Symmetry: C3
Subunit: 117 residues, 3 copies
């Protein structure tokens, strides 16, 4: 799959970015059984002040993980994976769980290409 991770520039050091990527990647491999190399984590950073919750401009602590998955997994599994990402990312980024949002989108495998194949 592909995990788009939206964070504020400078909030995560290159070291934290790696730890967050590993956390997400390990959770996915661990719970779905999909090979590690098949998981992409793409960080999209924006200047502080581009996030609004309830119309209020936030700091740089929000982290929105948008996971693009292959269809076919149970609701219970996706639920566990979503929670696992929250707990592990919170630890990896040393950021309070309340700052983490996670949304999973699905698509049939037939319209998904990874590594050009």
């Amino acid at each position: 799959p592909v995990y788009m991770v939206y964070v504020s520039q400078d909030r995560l050091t290159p070291s934290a970015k790696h730890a967050v990527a590993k956390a997400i990647t390990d959770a996915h491999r661990g719970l779905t059984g999909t090979q590690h190399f098949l998981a992409q984590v793409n960080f999209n950073e924006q200047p502080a002040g581009n996030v609004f919750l309830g119309g209020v401009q936030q700091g740089g602590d929000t982290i929105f993980v948008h996971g693009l998955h292959r269809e076919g997994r149970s609701a219970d599994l996706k639920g566990q994976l979503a929670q696992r990402i929250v707990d592990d990312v919170s630890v990896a980024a040393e950021i309070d769980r309340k700052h983490i949002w996670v949304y999973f989108g699905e698509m049939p495998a037939q319209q998904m290409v990874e590594y050009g194949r």
Copy 2:
């Protein structure tokens, strides 16, 4: 929900960004009844020249609103919400309606986490 808003850097002043966020947030709360704090607006800015319509490189006026919603709302409602966003954002950003694109994506509530819960 989470509204990813793609704009060109500098096109929206911090003041306009707030107005655009409030517009979108008010429309969602107003039409769906979902609490204000449950609506996130995430602005993703890119340098002018990263947008192409029909293969032609555009200026910095395009605004693409990609709304990530919870499944379960009628087509009529989503239709009204989409239009409401077009009218209100056009007013908030003082930008002609023709520059506004709006796409809604849906996901079951079970694979959606907000505020770590």
Copy 3:
């Protein structure tokens, strides 16, 4: 439709960006019959080092094409369009096919607005 294209800053020159946009746009028009002007290509660039495959930090060669489409097209067609994008983008960006990922997301036409309509 709207094609979000995630690349690393400076990897694509403005000339390559245009060629990549045309490639994608031509493939979509050619295979679906949807008018050229109805296809938006939105490049989202990030500094080198924001991409991780299998938890490993990559260079600036990855290109993730996330196509947001209107529902209703066959699996075979979406399959051909996905492949066509891989071949043509690889040529347009003079980048090896292994660096190209392509994911298609779908939504009913009723919750899709282009050019404010």
